[PDB]
Each structure stands twice: as structure tokens, then as C-alpha cells.
């Protein structure tokens, strides 16, 4: 025979291997293709699909539909509307996105998230909404004009229904880790009334709008690893 | 003088308008279409019955009202017993359908609430006992035009025999997956401020070129509430939704006697 | 091919407004920062090769644990236990099953791998010759053992593989097998039209994939007789799809599976942790 | 019959494959297939919507 000597690694089975092997029915002759909608090729391709962010998931709400939508009144509050932090692996309202649920099969993300915002008042209700994006390492806003110094848009409500702020990639890191991570931080997303919603008599004066999130062409991941949203007993 | 907002619809002897449309969904972006011969399988020559079955048929309307927590609807089933096109389906073994999909929903300037419209491709739905698995009668999947609602509570039955119904609970899309995700199905959303229906164009979709419409059906049609219906002067008002399915490119192989299902 | 770079951009002042959009249509949000900030020029270098189908389902994950022994076997039971037979699925763990379920359709070739594992029952017997096993794959039609030592396991046509204990772990390849152009992961259907006043019974039927799926049978043995030390082993089936195609996405699951179907169950319905408020970084 | 492609780069590259088996089944992974098309999933609108345009005129 050739001679030959085996190396380290000789009889190991590593699940991330890539080898040939036997086929256990040869000169099977596979059913022929044929061409069915919505081919698939890459997991970024749904990340770039927008879904509804959980933003109202508090006691009474979290597991209902009512979970979705974000409440908005005419009174005018100077109070935030929504406060979140950009960690949308592992946030308690981001993990279950569709982004999320993928960002938990991945170790590293990196690239622009964007948030679009549909408002459900009334073609009377008018208004206009403060967006922000704050970058870490500062006092979370709390207050529009903290919030208005970071990146943000003023949403005019109107005939076109949607608003669309970017978070956009800012990072010291050139990936964010897929937990939550001091070091990976990625900063504050806020909301307040620019003026306020109005609405004249015979109108609802609460209603509701909903936040969606989706990847931008910019986005990618890294390092495949095992979600901790499935298990079984044993 | 052409507007996303405002759109005709014809197949057949019948024509829809609407005035407050946001453009259409083609679902996947394919346009449905007849099957080819590099992609056939049963080898008899296939009745394609055209204008007879492909055109809107106009199901019972349903009742939004605050409280209501959403509807389900199958296809073909929700068209079994819809003219030619029902004929066509059960006089044959097989058949394969796209559909023109148009929900109908207006209400005023002053009323807001907004409707998810998704096409599920394999809408499976999770039965009504623990006692079981996958427990579910043909005629409870297969209601036909009436469809289902949506619950906003699961109580499964004490006895197996009791629970051979979906457990449609809302929120997880009566299959356990959360309802903020439908959106990676084709889908329009009807939000009273903006427009007053959806338009989604279906392809066949399916794991084969054509199969049994009896026993399977391709698309779960969905409508659930995201934003409540409110209404100031009566927030106990009810507005109809009013759901009009044409076939398309339907083609159907096998002929024999008629299929007669069971009704209990 | 890379992922997205950005341009060089300044403001606006204009009647172009790339910020607002109405999703009402189907239609995703588009914009992207060069459309609502000022940005720098950056060249992405960066690909997104570890999120390809093949990337993401390139991994032999454990789909099901077997058990068999070999000892002096005097009852039914014990006879039994010689020998092992399982309906080959992906249902009986839940992480790849979890994956796939990202999707309606899939083609794929498969990569099977098993892990074999041994320990004694008892110290005071003696001792046990290193055990052969056969892994049999029974089509769906080929007679099923009801022994150990039958004249199934002569094998002349199902493929069986014979693995030595302390050997690799054996491998093979099975073809893309459906006799569908895909395989299915879902099917809103049944296997039979029930028909108007027949006698067949409605009351006791299922609903779904499992009225209509049938990969076949794996049976196992351990080749050698019995020693007067009773050995029992592990058998851990491992599957890799390869030669990936998918279509049709889905919401992922998000609350435990309670079997084959999608059926969920009524004390774990409740993913989400309520958040303190609406305003909680 | 040896393919002789790139390889993934690392820290700071080509390599040989040769197939031994009859059946494409036994062969190892598909090449890195970088095909895209979200708009499929994203914007499957029958009517082309221009970004800086209204999406509703
Ligand atoms: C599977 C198992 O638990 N086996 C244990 C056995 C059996 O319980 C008895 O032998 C049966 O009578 O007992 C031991 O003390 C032994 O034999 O050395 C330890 C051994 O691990
Ligand atoms: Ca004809
Ligand atoms: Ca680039
Ligand atoms: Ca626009
Ligand atoms: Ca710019
Ligand atoms: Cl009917
Ligand atoms: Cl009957
Ligand atoms: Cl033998
Ligand atoms: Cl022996």
C-alpha cells in the first residue's frame, strides 16, 4: 500500500465537519424539480423583513395581541411614549422580532436596524412625533430635549401612514455580540410628542400606532450557535 | 390622474373597484399561471375551465367589531361550494389554483382600527385537547365560506373527543409562532385612516405541480385585528368585512363521479 | 459579494422623502440612514457567506436516542430489548426540527452520522466481547424484525451498515427521497376525502404531516449473542441536511412543542417577560 | 477531474476537491451560493414604489 501516517483529528466526528461520504442508495433517481414560489437563499434576506416589535408587553399585555400596539392619547405628556435599548437579540421586547429570533441563531451582528412606525388614529387625529436614536456612553434620554440631540426624526402624521427612523451602524466594535453586553452596548431608542396629537369632537382622542424593525442591506451576522428560545425535558 | 389609491379588478363576468387601495400584493412576486409541460404529472388532458370558475365569488361578510379578536379562512375550502369553480373541483381528483384575494373594509374618517390580511401558505392550526396530537375532524378544518375566528383564550376539551377543533388563539397565529411575525407571509394591512381594502394575487403554492383540493388545502387567508375598531359616538358600532376570492389559471385532472364530503 | 457599503452623503431640503412610506401596501420599510442622516463613505468588506442556507443547516444535530442490550433474554420483554426499531423523523428533539420549521418547503441530500455508546449493567457477571451492531434501514413496505436474530437482518436489498464498537463513527449519505418535488414541513390536509354516510370512522382521525408522512423504519441489533455480563448501549442518530433548498418562510416557533404537530400546550403559552413599562431601557 | 476554488480567507488559498463517490448525494457542501432577492418577502407590491416618491399619490 501507499504509505501513509495519521494526524491528530484521525476517527473524531466534528458536527461542523465536510466530508464525502457513502450513499446508502445508490443510482437513486431523485424526484425531478420543479419551480415552487418564495425560494429562500439566505437568513438576512428575512431579516430585512419588517416585524411588529412587542413594544407594550407589560403586565396584563406581554402573551396577548394587545402586546403590539402602542398607546398614544391627545393629551400632549412630555412623558416618553416608548423607551427601548438598542440589544435586539436580547432585549425582552426585540428577542421575539423575526431579527431577534434570527440574532439568536448568530454570536455577531453588525449594520443599520430600521424602525417604521404605523399610525392607527383617525384620518381627522393630526400630529407630530419626536424619534431618536441616542448612541451609548451618555444619561438615557428621558426628556425630549435630551433626545433631540441624538439622531432623530420629526414624524408629520398624515396621508402617507409611515415613519421610518434608522439606527444606524455606530459601533466601536466592527460586530455587537447576539446578549446582553456592556462592552457591545448599542445605545437608546426614544419617543415623545413634538406638539401633540389632535383631533376634533366625535373622534377617539386615544389610539394606537405599531413599531416594526427589519435589517438594512448594510446587515450582517456571524458564528452560528444554538438558541436559548427552545428546549426539551429529558 | 393614475393613483395607488384607485384600482379595477376584472376576471370573468365580474369587476371589482376600489378608491382606497394601497397598490396590490403579488405574493412572492410570482403571478400565478398554468402548469407547464416540463412540470406536469398526471398525463390526461386537463380541464381548464376559464371564465366558468375563474372570476369573484363574494363569501358572507363578517362583523368587526371592539371585542372581536380576528377570522380564518382556507383555500379552496372557503370556495368549495362557490358555482362552477366547486363543480370543477369536486368532479375531479385533482386541482391546482391561484386566487385574486380583495378584502373589503370601509368605515369613516372619524373610525381608526387596522386589519393584518395574511396568505399563510400551509396553514396548519393547532388542535383543542392535550389528551391528543394533530386531533382535528374534516369538518372542523374545512368550515368553508363561514371560515373561523380567532380566540383570545385556549382552553382545550377535558375529553380528546371534544377538542377535534383549532385552538386559534390570536396571538400565537393558532399554531405557536407569535402573531408579530405574520408579517413574512404576503400580506396587506387595512387601516381605516389610510384605505379600505387589500388586494393580494396568490400564485399555487405546494411541495407539487397539482394535488387533491378535498383533501388539501394551499393557503390560510387570515384577518386579525392589530389596532382595535374605535369609534367615539358608539365603541359598540360593528362594520362589515366583506372577503371576494377569484380563481386563477385553474386546471384540474382526473375526472370522475362528484366528491360528496362528509357534513358531520 | 457584500453586504451593503455606504455613500458619502450631506442633508436635504426637498420634496423627496424617502423617511415616510405606508406598510398598508405589503411593503417593508426601505429607507436606509444615507436617506435620513448625514453619512461618510465606509466600504463593507464583510459577506454574509455564515447565513446561506447551506451555513445555517451545515451542522450533524442529534435527532433521536436509541436503546438496545444484549443479554440472556427469557421473556418477552427481555427479547424485546435485543433489538430496537424507530420511524425515522426529525420530531423527537426540537433544535433542528426548529430550523427546518423556518420554512414550508426543503430539497436537501442528508448526512447521517450515529454515536454508539456502551456501559455494563452489573460487575459481579463477568465480562462482554467487543459488539457489532447492525443499523438497518427498512423501507416503507420491507418486513419489520420481531427478533434480534430473524431473517430480516440478512438485509439482501434495505441498506444496513455494520459498525464495529470503538470504530468512527460510521456515516452515510441518503438522497433527496421525496416522492413530492420537496419535502413538506407542513400540510394543511388530510390523507383521505371522508365521504357523505359512509361507515369509516370521523371520531379517531388525525390531521396534518403525520397522516402523511412515512420515511420508513431504523431497526437495530447488537450482532453478537449474549455474554454472561449484560451490556446496554446508546445509539445517537445524527442528521445534517446538504445540498439545501428552502421556500416559503415562517414565524419560528416560539412555545414548546407538545408532539409531531403544531398543537402547543396550555401551562407554557407565555414566551414574553413583561417588561416594569413601556419606557424600560 | 480535481476543482480548484478560493477558499474562505482567515486571520491574515486555494484548495483541491476531488469527488470519489458515484451518487452527488455523497458529495460535501454546496459552493457558498451569495443569491439574494428580500424584495421578494420585503416589497412584493404589483406596482414599483420609488423610495423618495409618496408610496400612496
Ligand atoms: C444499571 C445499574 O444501576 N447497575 C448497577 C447494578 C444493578 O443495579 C444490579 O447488579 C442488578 O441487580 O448493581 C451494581 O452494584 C453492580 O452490579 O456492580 C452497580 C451497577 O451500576
Ligand atoms: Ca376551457
Ligand atoms: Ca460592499
Ligand atoms: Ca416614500
Ligand atoms: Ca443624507
Ligand atoms: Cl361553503
Ligand atoms: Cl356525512
Ligand atoms: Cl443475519
Ligand atoms: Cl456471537
Not at chain 3, 426540537?94 to 448526512?111: A, P
Not at chain 3, 442528521?239 to 401551562?267: I, L, N, S, T
Request: glycine letters at 6%; aromatic letters at 12%; hydrophobic letters at 35%.
Amino acid at each position: 500500500g501507499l504509505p501513509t501516517m495519521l494526524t491528530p483529528g484521525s476517527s473524531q466526528f466534528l458536527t461542523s465537519d465536510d466530508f464525502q461520504s457513502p450513499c446508502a442508495l445508490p443510482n437513486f433517481d431523485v424526484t425531478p424539480p420543479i419551480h415552487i414560489p418564495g425560494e429562500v437563499f439566505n437568513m438576512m434576506e428575512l431579516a430585512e423583513i419588517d416585524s411588529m416589535i412587542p413594544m407594550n408587553s407589560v403586565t396584563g399585555k406581554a402573551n396577548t395581541m394587545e402586546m403590539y400596539p402602542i398607546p398614544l392619547d391627545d393629551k400632549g405628556s412630555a412623558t416618553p411614549i416608548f423607551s427601548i435599548s438598542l440589544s435586539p437579540a436580547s432585549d425582552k421586547r426585540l428577542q421575539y422580532t423575526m431579527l431577534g429570533e434570527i440574532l439568536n441563531y448568530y454570536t455577531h451582528w453588525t449594520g443599520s436596524l430600521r424602525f417604521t412606525f404605523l399610525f392607527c388614529g383617525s384620518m381627522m387625529a393630526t400630529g407630530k412625533i419626536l424619534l431618536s436614536y441616542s448612541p451609548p456612553g451618555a444619561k438615557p434620554p428621558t426628556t425630549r430635549k435630551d433626545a433631540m440631540l441624538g439622531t432623530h426624526i420629526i414624524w408629520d402624521l398624515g396621508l402617507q401612514s409611515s415613519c421610518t427612523m434608522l439606527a444606524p451602524w455606530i459601533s466601536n466594535t466592527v460586530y455587537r455580540r447576539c446578549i446582553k453586553d456592556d462592552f457591545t452596548e448599542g445605545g437608546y431608542i426614544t419617543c415623545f410628542y413634538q406638539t401633540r396629537i389632535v383631533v376634533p369632537s366625535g373622534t377617539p382622542t386615544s389610539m394606537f400606532m405599531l413599531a416594526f424593525v427589519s435589517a438594512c442591506p448594510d446587515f450582517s451576522v456571524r458564528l452560528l450557535r444554538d438558541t436559548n428560545h427552545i428546549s426539551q425535558r429529558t | 390622474g393614475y393613483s395607488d389609491r384607485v384600482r379595477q379588478i376584472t376576471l370573468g363576468n365580474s369587476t371589482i373597484t376600489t378608491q382606497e387601495a394601497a397598490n396590490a400584493v403579488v405574493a412572492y412576486g410570482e403571478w400565478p399561471s398554468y402548469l407547464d409541460d416540463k412540470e406536469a404529472n398526471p398525463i390526461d388532458a386537463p380541464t381548464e375551465p376559464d371564465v366558468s370558475s375563474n372570476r369573484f365569488y363574494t363569501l358572507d361578510s363578517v362583523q368587526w367589531k371592539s371585542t372581536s379578536r380576528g377570522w380564518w379562512w382556507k383555500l379552496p375550502d372557503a370556495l368549495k361550494d362557490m358555482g362552477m369553480f366547486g363543480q370543477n373541483m369536486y368532479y375531479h381528483y385533482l386541482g391546482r389554483s391561484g386566487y385574486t384575494v380583495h378584502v373589503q373594509c370601509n368605515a369613516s374618517k372619524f373610525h381608526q382600527g387596522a386589519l393584518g390580511v395574511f396568505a399563510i401558505p400551509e396553514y396548519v392550526m393547532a388542535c383543542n385537547t392535550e389528551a391528543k396530537t394533530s386531533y382535528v375532524s374534516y369538518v372542523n378544518a374545512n368550515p368553508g365560506e363561514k371560515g373561523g375566528v380567532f380566540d383570545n383564550a385556549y382552553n382545550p376539551s377535558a375529553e380528546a373527543s371534544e377538542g377535534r377543533k383549532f385552538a386559534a388563539l390570536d396571538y400565537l397565529l393558532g399554531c405557536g409562532v407569535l402573531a408579530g411575525n405574520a408579517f413574512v407571509y404576503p400580506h396587506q394591512i387595512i387601516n381605516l385612516r389610510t384605505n379600505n381594502s387589500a388586494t393580494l394575487v396568490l400564485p399555487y403554492v405546494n411541495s407539487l405541480a397539482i394535488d387533491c383540493m378535498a383533501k388539501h388545502n394551499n393557503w390560510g387567508l387570515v384577518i386579525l385585528p392589530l389596532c382595535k375598531l374605535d369609534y367615539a359616538p358608539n365603541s359598540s358600532t360593528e362594520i362589515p368585512i366583506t372577503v371576494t376570492i377569484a380563481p386563477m389559471f385553474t386546471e384540474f385532472n382526473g375526472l370522475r363521479n362528484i366528491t360528496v364530503p362528509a357534513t358531520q | 459579494p457584500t453586504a451593503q457599503s455606504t455613500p458619502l452623503t450631506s442633508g436635504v431640503n426637498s420634496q423627496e422623502v424617502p423617511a415616510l412610506t405606508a406598510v398598508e401596501t405589503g411593503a417593508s420599510g426601505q429607507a436606509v440612514p444615507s436617506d435620513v442622516i448625514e453619512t461618510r463613505h465606509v466600504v463593507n468588506y464583510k459577506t454574509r457567506s455564515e447565513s446561506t442556507l447551506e451555513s445555517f443547516f451545515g451542522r450533524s444535530a442529534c435527532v433521536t436516542i436509541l436503546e438496545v442490550e444484549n443479554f440472556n433474554a427469557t421473556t418477552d420483554a427481555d427479547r424485546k430489548k435485543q433489538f430496537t426499531t424507530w420511524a425515522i423523523t426529525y420530531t423527537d428533539t426540537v433544535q433542528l426540527r426548529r430550523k427546518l420549521e423556518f420554512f414550508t418547503y426543503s430539497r436537501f441530500d442528508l448526512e447521517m452520522t450515529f454515536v454508539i455508546t456502551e456501559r455494563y449493567y452489573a460487575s459481579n457477571t463477568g465480562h462482554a466481547r467487543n459488539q457489532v451492531y447492525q443499523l438497518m434501514y427498512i423501507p416503507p413496505g420491507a418486513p419489520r424484525p420481531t427478533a434480534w436474530d430473524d431473517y430480516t437482518w440478512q438485509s439482501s436489498s434495505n441498506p444496513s451498515v455494520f459498525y464495529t464498537y470503538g470504530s468512527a463513527p460510521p456515516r452515510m449519505s441518503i438522497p433527496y427521497v421525496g416522492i413530492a418535488n420537496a419535502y413538506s414541513h407542513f400540510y394543511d390536509g388530510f390523507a383521505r376525502v371522508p365521504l357523505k354516510d359512509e361507515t369509516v370512522d370521523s371520531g379517531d382521525t388525525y390531521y396534518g404531516l403525520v397522516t402523511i408522512n412515512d420515511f420508513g423504519t431504523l431497526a437495530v441489533r447488537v450482532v453478537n449473542e449474549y455474554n454472561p455480563a449484560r451490556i446496554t448501549s446508546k445509539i445517537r442518530v445524527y442528521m445534517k441536511p446538504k445540498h439545501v433548498r428552502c421556500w416559503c418562510p415562517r414565524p419560528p416557533r416560539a412555545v414548546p412543542y407538545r408532539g409531531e404537530g403544531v398543537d402547543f400546550k396550555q401551562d407554557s403559552i407565555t414566551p414574553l417577560t413583561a417588561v416594569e413599562n413601556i419606557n424600560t431601557f | 477531474g480535481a476543482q480548484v476554488s478560493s477558499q474562505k480567507v482567515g486571520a491574515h488559498v486555494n484548495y483541491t476537491t476531488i469527488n470519489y463517490y458515484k451518487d452527488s448525494a455523497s458529495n460535501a457542501a454546496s459552493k457558498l451560493d451569495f443569491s439574494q432577492d428580500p424584495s421578494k418577502f420585503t416589497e412584493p407590491v404589483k406596482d414599483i414604489m420609488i423610495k423618495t416618491a409618496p408610496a400612496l399619490n
